Write a protein that binds this ligand. Structure first.
Ligand SMILES: Nc1ncnc(N2CC[C@@H](Oc3ccncc3)C2)c1Cl
Length: 167
């Protein structure tokens, strides 16, 4: 038993809710919240901009030190940093950005990072401003992640389409 509430169960291990991941994170304090990161950990907009704003820019400060030491992430890669006031840890995961021309096949590699964590609160990777189809992202999630994932979908209209079209 865990503290996630109001989720619809899609599979043995994937759950989905119409929720703001920031508000969801502040209430649940999950062990891991996933950020929709880019390789530079520049948290300017979308999920990343929202999560970072909720940390009063502490996520960005930590991220800039990470990049100065380690260099950029790979598309499809991840790093574990602090969850600040939102979670114990933040798993920064880089899905391919279609608006930058990145290969969509890298979406599966991106979701594989979730398997290193038993339970996660996450957005749909490569959705929103990353330009991929969220229905495809949900399919890849279900077919790749084996650990327990709680997906927060900000847009109610999108949440209803994802559920109604789920196979
Ligand atoms: N998945 C998302 N994609 C893009 N923007 C989002 N947010 C939530 C509200 C606002 O973010 C904050 C964050 C901290 N204080 C007030 C508002 C935009 C989200 Cl939740």
């Amino acid at each position: 038993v865990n503290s996630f509430s109001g989720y619809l169960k899609l599979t043995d291990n994937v759950y989905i809710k119409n929720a703001d991941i920031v508000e969801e994170a502040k209430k649940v304090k999950p062990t891991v919240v996933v950020n929709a990161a880019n390789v530079y950990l520049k948290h300017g907009g979308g999920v990343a901009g929202a999560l970072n704003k909720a940390t009063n820019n502490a996520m960005q400060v930590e991220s800039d030190d990470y990049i100065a030491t380690n260099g950029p992430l790979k598309v499809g890669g991840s790093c574990v940093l602090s969850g600040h006031n939102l979670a114990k840890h933040c798993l920064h995961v880089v899905g391919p950005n279609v608006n930058k021309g990145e290969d969509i096949q890298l979406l599966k590699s991106a979701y594989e990072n979730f398997n290193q964590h038993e339970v996660l609160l996450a957005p749909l990777l490569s959705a929103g401003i990353f330009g991929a189809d969220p229905i495809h992202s949900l399919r890849v999630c279900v077919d790749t992640v084996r650990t327990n994932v709680y997906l927060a979908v900000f847009d109610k209209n999108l949440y209803d389409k994802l559920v109604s079209s789920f196979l």
